[PDB]
Every structure is written in structure tokens, then in C-alpha cells.
Amino acid sequence: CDAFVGTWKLVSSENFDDYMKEVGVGFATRKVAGMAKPNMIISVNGDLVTIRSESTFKNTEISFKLGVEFDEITADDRKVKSIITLDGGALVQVQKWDGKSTTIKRKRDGDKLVVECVMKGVTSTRVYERA
Amino acid sequence: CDAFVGTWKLVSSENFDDYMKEVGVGFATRKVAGMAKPNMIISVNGDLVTIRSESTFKNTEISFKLGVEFDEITADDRKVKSIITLDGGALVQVQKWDGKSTTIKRKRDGDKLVVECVMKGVTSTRVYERA
Ligand SMILES: CCCCCCCCCCCCCCCCS(=O)(=O)O
Numbered sequence: 001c002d003a004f005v006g007t008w009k010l011v012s013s014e015n016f017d018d019y020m021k022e023v024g025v026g027f028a029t030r031k032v033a034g035m036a037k038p039n040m041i042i043s044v045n046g047d048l049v050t051i052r053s054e055s056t057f058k059n060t061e062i063s064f065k066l067g068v069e070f071d072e073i074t075a076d077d078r079k080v081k082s083i084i085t086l087d088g089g090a091l092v093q094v095q096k097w098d099g100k101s102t103t104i105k106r107k108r109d110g111d112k113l114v115v116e117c118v119m120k121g122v123t124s125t126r127v128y129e130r131a
Numbered sequence: 132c133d134a135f136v137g138t139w140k141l142v143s144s145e146n147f148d149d150y151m152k153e154v155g156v157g158f159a160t161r162k163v164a165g166m167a168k169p170n171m172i173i174s175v176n177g178d179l180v181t182i183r184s185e186s187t188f189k190n191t192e193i194s195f196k197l198g199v200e201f202d203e204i205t206a207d208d209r210k211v212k213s214i215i216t217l218d219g220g221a222l223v224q225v226q227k228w229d230g231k232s233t234t235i236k237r238k239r240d241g242d243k244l245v246v247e248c249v250m251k252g253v254t255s256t257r258v259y260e261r262a
């Protein structure tokens with residue numbers, strides 16, 4: 001996934017608060033998340049891909065092998081089972097917890113990196129540009 | 132309540148979607164409500180006060196006597212018991228339904244009419260100016 005490597009900064013967000021609402025994130029956390037304009041850092045070392053999100057309030061980091069299910073603790077503190085695959089040039093992530101699931105797709109669009117999150121019909125789109 | 136009589140147009144909104152979230156309003160309805168910039172019309176005839184809200188998508192109207200509980204069907208279709216009193220120069224409304232309650236205060240602030248809605252700690256503020 002060479003096309004994803006680098007540091008990216010958030011440029012725009014659409015329906016993010018609504019997505020967090022469906023996921024079950026609390027008011028305060030949603031408020032903190034909404035003011036945060038995180039920087040996404042993606043790097044690859046061998047068959048391990050690392051995705052790091054940095055914000056003044058909270059940094060998250062996941063390292064994984066494409067196709068292998070792993071444990072992830074989300075920024076809003078959910079302990080989920082995640083699996084990320086490379087499909088059609090996009091990184092497709094599915095998170096499962098308590099009988100529920102959500103999909104997060106990271107894809108290239110022109111010179112931007114677009115992240116789409118889907119939870120029960122509600123879709124959020126966040127656009128990033130290289131920092 | 133002579134100070135409230137007239138037609139008012141929405142000028143600004145703060146945390147309205149979050150308030151609707153706490154009240155239990157669905158995604159689609161919240162989306163329609165968020166694009167609506169309603170006009171509030173207040174009039175008094177004898178001891179009956181009428182508050183009418185007009186929008187391209189939905190008009191609501193309630194007529195009541197201050198201090199007497201009455202039935203109200205909200206824009207989001209909840210059938211509630213409402214009671215409105217005049218306290219400290221402000222119209223204070225309490226809506227009760229299914230063991231829950233929310234308070235809506237309509238007050239004058241300078242030349243504006245301010246509406247504050249509170250639901251479980253979440254507070255929304257909407258400012259109106261004369262049309
Ligand atoms: C108290 C600190 C709060 C920090 C933010 C917390 C956010 C909690 C909700 C996270 C939902 C999942 C986000 C997936 C990546 C979206 S994207 O950002 O990668 O595009």
C-alpha cells in the first residue's frame with residue numbers, strides 16, 4: 001500500500017458527529033472529537049502496516065498484517081476485533097464488538113486520502129491532504 | 132406577554148442536533164429539521180396564547196392558557212403533555228412523555244428572542260430576530 005504512506009492532515013468532515021452517534025459515543029467525547037483535526041500517519045515495515053492518528057487530546061496506533069484479525073482499542077474506548085484487507089486499491093476495515101459492526105474504508109481520490117465510515121446506514125466522509 | 136408578539140426568523144442555532152439526539156429524533160427527521168430555518172409567530176387573544184412555527188416542511192401550532200396543562204403533538208411526532216408559565220419575564224415550557232421531560236424557555240434578550248431547550252444536561256440555544 002505504497003500509495004497510502006505518509007503524513008496526512010484533515011481537510012474536511014461530513015456527518016462525523018452522526019456516525020459517532022450511531023456508534024454510541026458520548027456527548028463529551030463527541031465534542032472533543034469534533035474539535036480535533038487529527039493527522040494520520042501511515043507506514044509499512046515488511047508485512048506490518050501501521051496507522052497512527054495524532055491529536056492534542058488522543059493519539060491512537062494500530063499495527064497489523066493485512067488479512068489477520070487483531071485486537072484494537074478505539075479512541076472512544078471500545079475494545080473491538082478488527083480485520084483490514086486490500087481490495088480494489090482500498091484498505092477496507094471491519095470492526096466488530098458486542099454483536100455490532102462498522103466498516104471504515106481508506107482510499108485514494110486524486111491527490112487526497114478519503115476515509116468513509118459506515119454504521120447502520122449512516123455514512124461519514126473525511127478528506128485528508130498530505131501534510 | 133406583549134414582548135413576545137410578532138413574527139420572528141431564525142438567526143443562529145447551537146447544539147440543536149445534539150438536543151434532538153437526546154430527545155430521540157431519528158436521523159432523517161434531524162436532517163430535515165437542520166435545514167429548516169423556521170419562522171416563529173406569537174399572538175395573544177384574550178387569555179389564549181398561540182405559538183406557531185412555520186417551515187416549508189412542517190408547520191406546528193399550539194394554543195394554550197398559561198398555567199393549564201394541555202396536549203401537544205411535536206414536529207417530530209411525539210404526543211406530550213405540556214405546561215407553559217410566565218416566570219421572570221420568560222415563557223417556561225415543560226414537556227412530559229413516557230416518564231421523560233424536557234424544558235423549553237423562550238425569553239427576550241435585547242432585541243432578539245432566544246429559545247433554550249434542555250434535555251438531560253444537553254442544552255441548545257436558538258436565536259431569532261424580528262422578521
Ligand atoms: C478524548 C479524546 C477524543 C479523541 C477523538 C475520539 C474519537 C472517538 C470516536 C472514534 C470513532 C472511529 C473513528 C475512525 C477513524 C475516523 S478518522 O479520524 O480516521 O478519519
Ligand SMILES: CCCCCCCCCCCCCCCCS(=O)(=O)O
Pocket residue numbers: 151154156160163164167169171184186188189205206207235246248257
Ligand atoms: C419533517 C419536517 C421536520 C420539521 C422539523 C422537525 C423538528 C423535530 C424536533 C423538534 C424538537 C422540539 C423543538 C422545540 C422548538 C425549537 S425552535 O425551532 O422553536 O427554536
